């Protein structure tokens, strides 16, 4: 609906289908870890034991 | 137990020496208070020895 | 880098770069133009302002 008054004018009204194909276009740069993330990455461990 | 290797206790021997034969045949009933996996520390009873 | 000149030979110039490793460096501007070409290094993409 194009309800709106004030004696304007319209011409060449269309309905066109669109295309879309952008996927990601960018990635995390390098992402070097810090000493604390390296240290906290080794908190949970399991020892393989021999009885 | 190879899943979470823990080495629970089955029992304890007492070593025979040349100078403790008499004092070992004298004792029985061995009251024990140990720590359990759940409901940790408590008295678990009094039972005679096994030999 | 850049080009520095002292039309009369006088006191030095102090260059302080602070991006990751703060550097100390002083040059002697000659009567003509010579370039200095001091280095630095960025370190996370989430760090502070680089201040030259």
């Amino acid at each position: 609906t194009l309800i709106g008054s004030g004696t304007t004018y319209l011409d060449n009204l269309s309905i066109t289908e669109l295309n879309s194909t952008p996927e990601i276009l960018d990635e995390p740069e390098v992402k070097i870890p810090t000493d604390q993330e390296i240290m906290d990455a080794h908190k949970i461990y399991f020892a393989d034991l021999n009885f | 137990n190879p899943s979470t290797g823990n080495t629970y206790i089955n029992g304890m021997y007492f070593a025979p020496t040349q100078t403790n034969k008499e004092a070992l045949d004298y004792i029985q009933k061995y009251r024990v208070e140990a720590t359990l996996q759940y409901s940790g520390f408590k008295d678990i009873g009094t039972k005679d020895k096994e030999m | 880098s850049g080009y520095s000149k002292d039309p009369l030979t006088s006191n030095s110039i102090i260059v302080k770069i602070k991006a990751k490793e703060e550097k100390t460096d002083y040059l002697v501007p000659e009567q003509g133009y010579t370039k200095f070409s001091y280095e630095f290094e960025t370190t996370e993409k989430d760090s502070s302002n680089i201040e030259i």
Side-chain angles (χ1 to χ4, degrees), chain B residues 9-29:
Chain B
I9 314 180
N10 289 337
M12 220 123 3
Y13 297 93
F14 288 102
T17 59
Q18 321 177 45
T19 49
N20 80 330
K21 172 62 168 172
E22 283 74 13
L24 273 196
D25 300 50
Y26 174 67
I27 295 295
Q28 285 106 1
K29 302 277 296 311

Side-chain angles (χ1 to χ4, degrees), chain C residues 3-11 27-35:
Chain C
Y3 283 80
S4 74
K5 177 191 63 180
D6 247 291
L8 50 85
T9 41
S10 295
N11 58 324
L27 67 142
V28 283
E30 301 184 334
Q31 202 108 289
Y33 300 85
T34 53
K35 68 180 315 162

Side-chain angles (χ1 to χ4, degrees), chain C residues 23-47:
Chain C
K23 262 301 202 24
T24 161
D25 225 316
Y26 323 102
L27 67 142
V28 283
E30 301 184 334
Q31 202 108 289
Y33 300 85
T34 53
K35 68 180 315 162
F36 27 95
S37 212
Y38 302 125
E39 326 177 25
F40 61 98
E41 161 170 4
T42 50
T43 34
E44 171 192 357
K45 197 50 182 192
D46 218 284
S47 173

Side-chain angles (χ1 to χ4, degrees), chain A residues 8-22:
Chain A
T8 189
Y9 298 112
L10 303 178
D11 217 11
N12 298 152
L13 290 162
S14 342
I15 308 174
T16 232
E17 320 172 340
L18 272 198
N19 306 337
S20 295
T21 190

